[PDB]
Amino acid sequence: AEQRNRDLQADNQRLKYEVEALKEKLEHQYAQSYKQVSVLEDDLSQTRAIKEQLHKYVRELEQANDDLERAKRATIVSLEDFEQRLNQAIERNAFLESELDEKESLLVSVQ
C-alpha cells in the first residue's frame, strides 16, 4: 500500500515531465510548420500568377501568328496588283514593237 503509493508517486513525476517535454517538441514542430505553410501559400499565389502570364503568353503568340499571316497576304496581293500594271506596260511595249516592224516593212520596200 505504501510501496504502491511510492511507485505511483514516482510514475506520476515521470509522466508529468514526459508530458512537459512533448508539449515542447509540439510547439517547435508547430512554429516550423507555420513557417513552411507561409511559403506554400506564397508559392500558390506566385504560381497562379505565373500560370496566368503563360496563358497570356500563348494568346499573344497566337496574335503574332495572325499578324504574320496578314503580313504574308498583304505583301503578295500588293505585289500582284503591281504585276498587273507592269504586264499592261510590257503589253504596250509589244505593240510598239509590232508597229516598228510595220514601219520597217514600209521603209525596206523603198527604191
Question: Which residues of this protein are in contact with Hg ion, per CB under 5 A?
Answer: 41, 44-45
- In whole angstroms, what is the distance from residue 48 CA to residue 54 CA? 10
Please give the full DSSP string across 87-104, using - where no structure is assigned. Answer: HHHHHHHHHHHHHHHHHH
Q: Which residue, judged by CB position, is nearest to Hg ion in the bound state?
A: 45
CB closer to Hg ion out of 41 and 66: 41
Considering only residues 26 to 85 of the shown chain, the ones binding a second copy according to CB under 8 A are 26, 29-30, 32-33, 35-37, 39-44, 46-51, 53-58, 60-83, 85
| DSSP 8-state symbol, 109 | T
CB of 31 to a second copy, least distance (A): 10
- In whole angstroms, what is the distance from residue 17 CA to residue 14 CA? 5
CB of 13 to a second copy, least distance (A): 10
